[PDB]
Scaffold this active site. Structure first.
Site, PDB file in Angstrom:
ATOM      1  N   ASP F  39       0.295  -1.240  -0.034  1.00 30.88           N
ATOM      2  CA  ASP F  39       0.373  -0.150   0.310  1.00 30.88           C
ATOM      3  C   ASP F  39       0.829   1.229  -0.333  1.00 30.88           C
ATOM      4  O   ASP F  39       2.303   1.198   0.202  1.00 30.88           O
ATOM      5  CB  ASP F  39      -0.921   0.066   1.038  1.00 30.88           C
ATOM      6  CG  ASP F  39      -2.119   0.948   0.987  1.00 30.88           C
ATOM      7  OD1 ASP F  39      -2.389   0.999   0.348  1.00 30.88           O
ATOM      8  OD2 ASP F  39      -1.871   1.964   2.810  1.00 30.88           O
TER       9      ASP F  39
HETATM   10  C1  8Q1 Z   1       1.510  10.727  18.327  1.00 32.42           C
HETATM   11  C2  8Q1 Z   1       1.614  11.139  17.648  1.00 32.42           C
HETATM   12  C3  8Q1 Z   1       0.083  12.321  17.889  1.00 32.42           C
HETATM   13  C4  8Q1 Z   1      -0.810  12.345  16.684  1.00 32.42           C
HETATM   14  C5  8Q1 Z   1      -0.718  11.307  16.199  1.00 32.42           C
HETATM   15  C6  8Q1 Z   1      -1.928  10.936  14.690  1.00 32.42           C
HETATM   16  C7  8Q1 Z   1      -3.441  10.678  16.030  1.00 32.42           C
HETATM   17  C8  8Q1 Z   1      -4.286  11.028  13.982  1.00 32.42           C
HETATM   18  C9  8Q1 Z   1      -4.402  10.433  13.651  1.00 32.42           C
HETATM   19  C10 8Q1 Z   1      -5.056  10.770  12.331  1.00 32.42           C
HETATM   20  C11 8Q1 Z   1      -6.575  10.633  11.934  1.00 32.42           C
HETATM   21  C12 8Q1 Z   1      -6.972  10.451  10.604  1.00 32.42           C
HETATM   22  O1  8Q1 Z   1      -7.537  10.085   9.998  1.00 32.42           O
HETATM   23  S1  8Q1 Z   1      -6.346  11.331   9.182  1.00 32.42           S
HETATM   24  C13 8Q1 Z   1      -6.346  10.993   7.821  1.00 32.42           C
HETATM   25  C14 8Q1 Z   1      -7.898   9.835   7.081  1.00 32.42           C
HETATM   26  N1  8Q1 Z   1      -7.337  10.206   5.977  1.00 32.42           N
HETATM   27  C15 8Q1 Z   1      -7.653   9.039   5.384  1.00 32.42           C
HETATM   28  O2  8Q1 Z   1      -7.732   7.964   5.622  1.00 32.42           O
HETATM   29  C16 8Q1 Z   1      -7.848   9.666   3.506  1.00 32.42           C
HETATM   30  C17 8Q1 Z   1      -7.940   8.317   2.758  1.00 32.42           C
HETATM   31  N2  8Q1 Z   1      -7.800   6.737   2.488  1.00 32.42           N
HETATM   32  C18 8Q1 Z   1      -7.611   6.776   1.488  1.00 32.42           C
HETATM   33  O3  8Q1 Z   1      -7.396   7.417   0.652  1.00 32.42           O
HETATM   34  C19 8Q1 Z   1      -6.495   6.065   1.294  1.00 32.42           C
HETATM   35  O4  8Q1 Z   1      -6.848   4.391   1.529  1.00 32.42           O
HETATM   36  C20 8Q1 Z   1      -4.573   5.630   2.136  1.00 32.42           C
HETATM   37  C21 8Q1 Z   1      -5.098   5.453   3.543  1.00 32.42           C
HETATM   38  C22 8Q1 Z   1      -4.533   7.121   1.980  1.00 32.42           C
HETATM   39  C23 8Q1 Z   1      -3.997   5.066   1.008  1.00 32.42           C
HETATM   40  O5  8Q1 Z   1      -3.965   4.210   0.239  1.00 32.42           O
HETATM   41  P1  8Q1 Z   1      -3.630   4.278  -1.046  1.00 32.42           P
HETATM   42  O6  8Q1 Z   1      -3.039   5.193  -1.843  1.00 32.42           O
HETATM   43  O7  8Q1 Z   1      -3.476   3.122  -1.859  1.00 32.42           O
HETATM   44  O8  8Q1 Z   1      -5.362   4.578  -1.425  1.00 32.42           O
END
Ligand code: 8Q1
Ligand code: SF4
Ligand code: SF4
Lengths: 140, 385, 112, 10, 185, 83, 165, 27
Positions: F39
């Site tokens: 991925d």
């Molecule tokens: C200690 C650190 C503190 C912070 C830690 C983080 C805390 C928040 C975590 C993030 C919260 C969220 O949901 S922010 C991120 C949420 N946004 C998405 O998931 C976009 C939809 N996903 C897709 O398009 C694809 O599945 C993809 C996964 C991109 C790849 O697959 P491909 O490219 O093959 O297409």
């Protein structure tokens, strides 16, 4: 007759020459409002009050008399208005909001519910005559 | 540069003050105030209360100037109700708002001077503060949180000797102010610790939303009691003090003059107060007399409906601001036509003043940061609701 | 610095997700020192935790929702970088972790 | 309430 | 200077494509505009000679769950020179980013941070958009109509854990809602 | 300059820790996202692991260019920082 | 400037002539009667309108005035009152449970001014600090004891503000 | 009733509100 000792406002400083820094800003404003379309409400008002203030600044040599006839702030509060109108003209020109849309519609609500008298209401005095002269210019 | 923390938990400076300072040497370069420690959800609690039930919340917003917030809330409700207030009630409200202004100024000046190191004027001023709070205890039953000013008229009438006692107080408050000034105004140390500290231009004050003494110290003659007069303020004679340098010393001279003028207004209100009723006669919005509720059927119905449901404000929204001692205190009240406010934002002057601490303290000594905080006269009841 | 303008397509949303993930991964060394996580967690278990959050929030197809999720995650990351949150809080959120389910719930309470 | 609606009006 | 003059002047001078709703009353002269013209309108109303509005009093949000554009953002403005107040309103839902006005009014920063904290509306080009009032790690925006009055979590001291901990809320006496509404309203 | 021997081992070792990567398929030439069916999150995770086993940094414009372990190990062997 | 003015202001700079004027002011207050009160023996002045400890009153015949109208529970801005009522053996409308949370009470007096029978009143007592949280959960018995203990003062105060309420 | 709190007939006595000067010291 003497130079203004203080403007009474912190940050605002007395300009030794105010009839020469305003006669130039008004000329620039009148030479730069030309880019705005002729039949726009902004251009007519900005070219009316800027013409009157420019004429006043040309007739009377002393700043006290200019303050008296315009009667709207000190000559040091007029320079800061001219320099802001010059900026606004440029921002209007670069944005170009002059295009009236074909599907434009505005709901002009007109409410008349009275409010009491003791309630705090902003009641100013009569504005200088130009604020109405520009208004009739805009309506006409 | 290092990252230093002032959290004074002791109320020798506010009490919930949390500054995170970035000091290069002894100068401070950026002052980030961390607020939210006194955020009690007041704005959301208003939406769950009746318009009468939400009045006591405004006493606890600026707990140094209590009647100022009630006056603003009552005026907002009157504006949304088109309720006329009798002249005697207006005179009483102005009188107890100018008493409140003196109370706030007396607390602010001496809690600021105590931060500098002057301990004597603090007790002297709190003596007159107690004398004034005695009047608060007389009309109401509370020394500080008096639900006296109410949307219709005023809660209840004045006791018999209150006017005489207030006049007796005003006969000596002038000498009290003279002593308080003579302890601080002429002192060279007080001048050296205030002059040229905290300078703000008029443009900066306008841009950052400054109001009251913070704005009038920069040369801007803007008083809400003369620009947008309310109650009987347009029938009273008083001057508006205006500063010239914008520093902390001008904020102090103006904070003296505003209290002398408050004494003047109090004297005029005492002399010109008329007779009559203290509440609006629309008993659909005001409580009936206790003798009329126990003798008339419609008066009892009005009492029952008012003390459970309260009045209903027609669907509208407006912003009303008064000249609170700190500055411009505004209430944005939204009504949907029910007996409970739909939305009520509280515009606190302290919120707009503690936000400007960053530019006022930049390139100043560390010991000069407490004077800048104290000259704004900040209480955190209003800063974070 | 300033909040970025709202995205216009899913590709920009994916790019922002990857940028935020890389920033969070670079933030891992700082947390291990600010909080005594040296002899607590491997430097990759946390990375897997952020990856798992991104993956179980990966069914979103609205660019605005993705941007808001990224913004909230960045706010959380900035808060964790500072000493704002308590130590056990991140260890309580950022650690990777028989008859019938119905019968156990029935034995527990009537309100499933 | 006088809630008349403006239009382009050519 | 006055509601009768400001309304008529802004009717003529303002570009028509900006404002789409103009109420003129005694409660306040309001301007309702699209979110993509808010910055333009507020910059025009800050620099024009006859509409010198140089003070931003506050920025508040209002929650209307029944509308498609759920949140209403209100800009209360003040003109010291002409002694007049203007109110400008926009509408935004939960996933739209409206433009920030900190460039024009430096005091807009804390009010925009408070609006984001209380309602969840994000502002484009804001130097730092983080929560300002709620507790660190707060989840949810309290000033929304669907947010419970007492919230979701509660705080107590845990002696074995030797720290103040957050737990799901559990009231000893629940908030009693009294329905005083009348059918004859 | 670094020899191919150890740079090949350092990239053939860390890739087997993804609980799905087949040890039998990893070799000096085995693309991350294409040949292993990975991925895009794993495509950036391999690069981040490259800077997780050392201290150097990969700019955001150097991560999405080539997802091939042959050029990846060539670039690793052309890192003066590593040893 | 003028030599005389320069000399005069230079003397004040070196002779501290504006600190002696404050030292004299402080010394004058030193030899002055004090304004402190002996709290245990003498108390500060109050008013008949003082809002202190709550009390439930009863009729001179011995019947409690509370009629379980719940008009004070609905006006209470702090939701500090909880009332349970039923029909008594005589058929009269009375309360079985009437408890006030004094840890929620804001002492605003709304309950006192909403009672149509003058049953609940805030008495003059302000010295009721307890050593336990549950002792601040006043119930019907505690409130009735307060009303019986402060009956004469409460009656006199209610007579005083009869001319105003 | 008809006996209400207010100023006595003729008004209250005038009260100073300005700063009183203090010329103390030989200088
Ligand atoms: C200690 C650190 C503190 C912070 C830690 C983080 C805390 C928040 C975590 C993030 C919260 C969220 O949901 S922010 C991120 C949420 N946004 C998405 O998931 C976009 C939809 N996903 C897709 O398009 C694809 O599945 C993809 C996964 C991109 C790849 O697959 P491909 O490219 O093959 O297409
Ligand atoms: S005084 Fe106010 S808060 Fe206390 S019980 Fe009575 S109504 Fe409720
Ligand atoms: S105390 Fe008074 S208001 Fe409260 S329930 Fe009893 S009678 Fe009604």
């Amino acid at each position: 007759a003497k130079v203004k000792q203080t403007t009474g406002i912190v940050g605002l400083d007395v300009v030794p020459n105010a009839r020469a820094v305003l006669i130039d800003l008004y000329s620039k404003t009148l030479k730069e409002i030309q880019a705005v379309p002729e039949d726009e409400g902004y251009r007519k008002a900005v070219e009316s009050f800027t013409r009157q203030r420019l004429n006043v600044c040309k007739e009377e040599e002393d700043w006290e008399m200019i303050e008296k006839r315009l009667g709207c702030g000190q000559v040091e509060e007029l320079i800061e208005e001219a320099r802001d109108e010059l900026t606004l003209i440029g921002k209007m020109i670069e944005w170009d909001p002059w295009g009236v849309p074909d599907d434009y519609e505005c709901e002009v609500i007109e409410n008349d519910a009275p409010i009491p008298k003791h309630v705090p209401q902003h009641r100013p005095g009569p504005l200088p005559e130009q604020f109405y002269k520009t208004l009739e210019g805009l309506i006409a | 540069n290092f990252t230093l923390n002032f959290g004074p938990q002791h109320p020798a400076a506010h009490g919930v003050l949390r500054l995170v300072l970035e000091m290069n040497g002894e100068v401070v370069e950026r002052a980030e105030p961390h607020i939210g420690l006194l955020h009690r959800g007041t704005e959301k609690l208003i939406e769950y209360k009746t318009y009468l039930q939400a009045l006591p919340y405004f006493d606890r917003l600026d707990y140094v100037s209590m009647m100022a917030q009630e006056h603003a809330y009552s005026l907002a409700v009157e504006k949304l109700l088109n309720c006329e207030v009798p002249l005697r009630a207006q005179y009483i409200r102005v009188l107890f708002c100018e008493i409140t202004r003196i109370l706030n100024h007396l607390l602010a000046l001496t809690t600021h001077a105590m931060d500098v190191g002057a301990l004597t004027p603090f007790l002297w001023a709190f003596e007159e503060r107690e004398k004034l709070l005695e009047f608060y205890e007389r009309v109401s039953g509370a020394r500080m949180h008096a639900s006296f000013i109410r949307p219709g008229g005023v809660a209840q009438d004045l006791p018999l000797g209150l006017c005489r006692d207030i006049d007796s107080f005003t006969q000596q408050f002038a000498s009290r102010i003279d002593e308080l000034e003579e302890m601080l105004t002429g002192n060279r140390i007080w001048k050296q610790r205030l002059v040229d500290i905290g300078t703000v231009t008029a443009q900066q004050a306008k841009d950052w939303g400054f109001s009251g003494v913070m704005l009038r110290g920069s040369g801007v003659c803007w008083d809400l009691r003369r620009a947008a007069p309310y109650d009987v303020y347009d029938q009273l004679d008083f001057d508006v003090p205006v500063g010239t340098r914008g520093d902390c010393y001008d904020r102090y001279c103006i904070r003296i003059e505003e209290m002398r003028q408050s004494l003047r207004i109090i004297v005029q209100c005492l002399n010109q107060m008329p007779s009559g009723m203290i509440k609006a006669d629309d008993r659909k919005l005001c409580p009936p007399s206790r003798c009329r509720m126990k003798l008339s059927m419609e008066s009892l119905i009005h009492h029952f409906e008012l003390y459970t449901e309260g009045f209903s404000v027609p669907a509208s929204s407006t912003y009303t601001a008064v000249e609170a001692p700190k500055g411009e205190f505004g209430v944005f009240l939204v009504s949907n036509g029910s007996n409970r406010p739909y939305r009520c934002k509280i515009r606190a002057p302290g919120f707009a003043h503690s936000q400007g601490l960053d530019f006022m303290s930049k390139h100043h000594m560390l010991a000069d940061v407490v004077t800048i905080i104290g000259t704004q006269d900040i209480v955190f009841g209003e800063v974070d609701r | 610095i300033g909040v970025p303008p709202n995205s216009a397509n899913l590709t920009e949303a994916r790019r922002r997700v990857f940028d935020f993930f890389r920033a969070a991964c670079r933030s891992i060394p700082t947390i291990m020192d600010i909080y005594n996580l040296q002899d607590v967690v491997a430097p990759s278990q946390l990375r897997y935790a952020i990856s798992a959050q991104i993956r179980n929030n990966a069914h979103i197809t609205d660019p605005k929702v993705i941007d808001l999720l990224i913004f909230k995650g960045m706010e959380e990351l900035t808060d964790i970088v500072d000493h704002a949150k308590q130590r056990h809080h991140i260890i309580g959120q950022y650690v990777v972790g028989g008859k019938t389910d119905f019968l156990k719930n029935f034995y527990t309470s009537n309100y499933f | 309430i006088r809630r008349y609606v403006l239009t382009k009006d050519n | 200077m006055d509601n009768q003059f400001i309304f008529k002047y802004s009717w003529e001078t303002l570009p028509k494509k900006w404002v789409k709703k103009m109420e003129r009353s005694e409660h306040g002269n309001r301007f309702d505009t699209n979110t993509d013209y808010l910055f333009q309108l507020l910059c025009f109303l800050k620099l024009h000679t006859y509409t010198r509005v140089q003070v931003l009093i506050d920025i508040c949000g209002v929650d209307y769950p029944s509308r498609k554009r759920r949140f209403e953002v209100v800009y209360n403005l003040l003109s010291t020179r002409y002694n007049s107040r203007i109110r400008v309103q926009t509408s935004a839902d939960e996933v739209t980013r409206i433009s920030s006005v900190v460039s024009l009014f430096p005091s807009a920063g804390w009010w925009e941070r408070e609006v984001w904290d209380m309602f969840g509306v994000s502002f484009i080009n804001h130097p730092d958009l983080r929560r300002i009032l709620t507790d660190y790690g707060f989840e949810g925006h309290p000033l929304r109509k669907d947010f419970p009055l007492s919230g979701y979590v509660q705080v107590r001291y845990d002696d074995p854990e030797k720290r103040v901990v957050s737990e799901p809320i559990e009231m000893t006496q629940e908030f009693r809602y009294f329905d005083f509404a009348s059918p004859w309203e | 300059f670094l020899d191919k021997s150890e740079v090949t081992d350092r990239v053939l070792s860390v890739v087997k820790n993804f609980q799905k990567v087949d040890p039998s398929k990893v070799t000096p030439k085995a693309n991350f996202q294409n040949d292993l069916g990975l991925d895009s999150l794993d495509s950036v995770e391999v690069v981040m692991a490259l800077e997780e086993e050392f201290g150097f940094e990969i700019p955001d414009n150097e991560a999405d260019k080539i997802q091939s372990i042959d050029l990846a190990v060539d670039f690793i062997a052309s890192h003066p920082q590593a040893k | 400037k003028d030599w005389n003015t320069v000399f005069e202001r230079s003397i004040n700079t070196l002779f501290l002539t504006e600190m002696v004027r404050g030292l004299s002011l402080t010394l004058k207050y030193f030899f002055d009667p004090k304004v402190t009160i002996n709290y245990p023996f003498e108390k500060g002045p109050l008013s008949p309108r003082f809002r202190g400890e709550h009390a439930l009153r009863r009729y001179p015949t011995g019947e409690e005035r509370c009629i379980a109208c719940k008009l004070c529970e609905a006006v209470c801005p702090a939701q500090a009152i909880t009332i349970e009522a039923e029909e008594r053996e005589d058929g009269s409308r009375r309360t079985t449970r009437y408890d006030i949370d004094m840890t929620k009470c804001i002492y605003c007096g709304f309950c006192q001014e909403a009672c149509p029978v003058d049953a609940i009143v805030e008495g003059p007592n302000f010295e009721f600090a307890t050593e336990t949280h549950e002792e601040l959960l006043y119930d019907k018995e505690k409130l009735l004891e307060n009303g019986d203990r402060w009956e004469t003062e409460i009656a006199e105060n209610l007579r005083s503000e009869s001319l105003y309420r | 009733p008809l006996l209400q709190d207010g100023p006595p007939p003729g008004g209250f006595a005038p009260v100073r509100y300005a700063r009183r000067i203090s010329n103390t010291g030989p200088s």
